[PDB]
Amino acid sequence: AQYEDGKQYTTLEKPVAGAPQVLEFFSFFCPHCYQFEEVLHISDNVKKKLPEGVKMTKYHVNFMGGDLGKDLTQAWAVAMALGVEDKVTVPLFEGVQKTQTIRSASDIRDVFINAGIKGEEYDAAWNSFVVKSLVAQQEKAAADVQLRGVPAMFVNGKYQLNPQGMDTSNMDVFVQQYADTVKYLSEKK
């Protein structure tokens, strides 16, 4: 098996010229969400070998049958705006992965304020242009690629992996094969 267009990565017919060599689509409501950036250390391990010829972007999805999820996308913007992710993500990742208390945009705000992001600070961050710029780019991120399966990854907006529960029984071959998928697709151009 050597990536047969569809096995370890398929191709979409709606590419995005300029797209990121590695667009990452993930929200705080997936089963791999918590296992993709915490236990499988696939986020750091892949970053340890990040070559300066591949832009790894990370975006939030807006399709988890959870209206607050859309606000959750505002979470990736309002957070990246105040670098409060590490702070609200912990109580946010464990909030949707062990409690289910995260089911209301108002809830996403409860954890946001838990990081000292008083509604005044966040309400201003969003009301601002830089945070709003990351918000319009977010909806535009999944709106341009469309996105239809979390977690989702798109290289240069042309090659998209297919991590839909591989279950290969080899977390070692998955971290190596994956690190390769991005290492070779980075050779596309």
Burial call 103-132: b when 16+ CB within 10 Å, e when fewer: eeeebbbebbeebebeeebbeebeeeeebb
Report the 10 Å Cβ neighbour count for 62: 22
> Three-class SS of residue 108?
helix
Q: Which of 134, 160, 27, 154 is nearest to 36 (CA)?
A: 27
Q: Quote the domain boundaries for residue 115.
A: 1-189
How far apart CA 165 and CA 32 sit, in angstroms, is: 9
Method: NMR
Instruction: To the nearest 10°, report the CA torsion of 108, 119, 58, 178.
Output: -40
Instruction: Compute the distance between CA of residue 24 and CA of residue 73 in angstroms, rounded to an integer.
Output: 13
CB 186 within 8 A of CB 54: yes
Query: What residue type is assigned to position 142 of the chain?
Result: A
Q: How many domains does the chain have?
A: 1
Q: What is the CATH number of the domain that holds 9?
A: 3.40.30.10
Classified as helix, coil or strand, 22 is: strand
Ranges assigned E (strand) in 27-156: 56-59, 152-155
> 27 near 20, Cβ under 8 Å?
no
